[PDB]
Amino acid sequence: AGNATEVPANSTVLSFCAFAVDAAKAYKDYLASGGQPITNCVKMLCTHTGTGQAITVTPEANMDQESFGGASCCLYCRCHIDHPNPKGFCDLKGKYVQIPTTCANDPVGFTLKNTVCTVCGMWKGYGCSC
Amino acid sequence: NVTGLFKDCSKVITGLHPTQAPTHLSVDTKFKTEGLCVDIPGIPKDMTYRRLISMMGFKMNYQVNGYPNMFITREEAIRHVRAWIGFDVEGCHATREAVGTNLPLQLGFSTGVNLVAVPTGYVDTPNNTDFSRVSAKPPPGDQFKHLIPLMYKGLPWNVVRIKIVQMLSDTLKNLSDRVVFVLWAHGFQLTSMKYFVKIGPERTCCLCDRRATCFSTASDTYACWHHSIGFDYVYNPFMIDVQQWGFTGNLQSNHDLYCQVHGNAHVASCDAIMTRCLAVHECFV
Ligand SMILES: [Cl-]
Ligand SMILES: [Mg+2]
Ligand SMILES: [Zn+2]
Ligand SMILES: [Zn+2]
Ligand SMILES: [Zn+2]
Ligand SMILES: [Zn+2]
């Protein structure tokens, strides 16, 4: 009974971060020890003619980005654990997230380490120019 | 292929919207094409779903510098025999709104303690994961008849995990600086540990120099067995699966080869007693 959601390649990293006190630190240290990034994300087939904004309601990837489902790029959604927001809300779930193509191999790691510029709506260091 | 970890146990026939699906596999078939997914303007995302997510299938085989291993070798466990705590869980099956996963019902320890918990699972919502009570039924069988009245005698998990930390602290504070959960078929026991175990780097107690064995979510502090009053989580425990030592058959048949003073199987504490008893006879004779 039921429908599987994950693949065996993610079993180690997801189990490790699902038990950790600081899951963000756990995933960063997991990558630092040579661990494979979380795969099985929701990669979007899009026109790549989007605005390039970081977090959008529709895929807005440009020629230098890949579009992903927001929930699939959130470490806390992938591990089914609490989000750091005091209300428990998620900044990515229900939205699409644009990831630079050079960082598309680890979408979960990119959203965990980078911040969206509140002025122009693009990633600081990956689109922002404020 | 796929794994059973984080399996969606809801009865909803449709998948998830690409923005709400945690994985590519959980996306609804309507959005999938060419190995990717497409956004379809006009098909809205669901805002009222509750999908029970299975916690069966954890694999604690990570190798991260600075993080200790949970599962230890037999020789390491023998060195820390003073920290051995037998551990077993009798579970219940999710029903009604979900099906396909088991939930911890009666947690037993080699100290003779049984803790009955309210059937609680991890439910994915459009906003986050909801740790809440779920509909469950006892498993069919005459050896599981004693679990039927326990379905309406459980405690909230916030109280259960505090009692676990209190029981382990009173038992091991004068015996060892750690805990070694002695297991038989670690699958569901490891699933139950998700409810009361946290891991991380080796920390020291906030009041002394001993290593940290407990964690408090209310204060974000760490403590040893001596100073863990009020703490709710076991921190960096160790464990080993006796069934993986080359035994054939169930737990009681192998336990009875060495011991004749323990019985009453399928009760959580009694299985935990037989597990620790079998581990002692197998390792030190
Ligand atoms: Cl250690
Ligand atoms: Mg049992
Ligand atoms: Zn999230
Ligand atoms: Zn900017
Ligand atoms: Zn202390
Ligand atoms: Zn015995």
Residue numbers in the entry:
A (entry chain M): 1 to 130
B (entry chain A): 3 to 287
Q: What did the paper state?
A:
SARS-CoV-2 nonstructural protein 14 (nsp14) exoribonuclease (ExoN) plays important roles in the proofreading during viral RNA synthesis and the evasion of host immune responses. To mitigate the low fidelity of RdRp, all coronaviruses encode a 3′-to-5′ exoribonuclease (ExoN) in multifunctional nsp14 (10–12), which forms a complex with nsp10 critical for the ExoN activity, and additionally contains a C-terminal guanine N7 methyl transferase (N7-MTase) domain. The multifunctional SARS-CoV-2 nsp14 consists of the N-terminal ExoN domain involved in proofreading and the C-terminal N7-MTase domain that functions in mRNA capping. Collectively, these results show that the N-terminal ExoN domain of SARS-CoV-2 nsp14 is sufficient for binding to nsp10 to form an active exonuclease complex that preferentially degrades dsRNA.
An ExoN variant with a nuclease-inactivating mutation (E191Q) was used in our crystallographic studies, as it was expressed more robustly and generated a more stable complex with nsp10 than wild-type ExoN. We obtained crystals under two different conditions, one containing ammonium tartrate and the other containing magnesium chloride (MgCl2), albeit in the same crystal form. The structures were determined by molecular replacement phasing and refined to 1.64- and 2.10-Å resolution for the tartrate and magnesium-bound crystals, respectively. The final models consist of nsp14 residues Asn3 to Arg289 (Val287 for the lower-resolution structure) and nsp10 residues Ala1 to Cys130, with two zinc ions bound to each polypeptide chain. While our structures of SARS-CoV-2 ExoN–nsp10 obtained in the two different crystallization conditions are highly similar, they show notable differences in the exonuclease active site located around the “knuckles” of ExoN. In the crystal grown in the presence of MgCl2, we observed a magnesium ion octahedrally coordinated by Asp90, Glu92, Asp273, and three water molecules. Another magnesium ion required for the conserved two-metal ion mechanism of 3′-5′ editing exonucleases was not observed. The previously reported SARS-CoV nsp14–nsp10 structures also showed only one metal ion, bound at an alternative site between Asp90 and Glu191 (21, 26). This site is unoccupied in our structure, presumably due to the E191Q mutation. A comparison between the Mg2+-bound and free structures shows a significant rearrangement for residues Gly265 to Val269 including the main chain atoms, accompanying an inward movement of His268 upon Mg2+ binding.
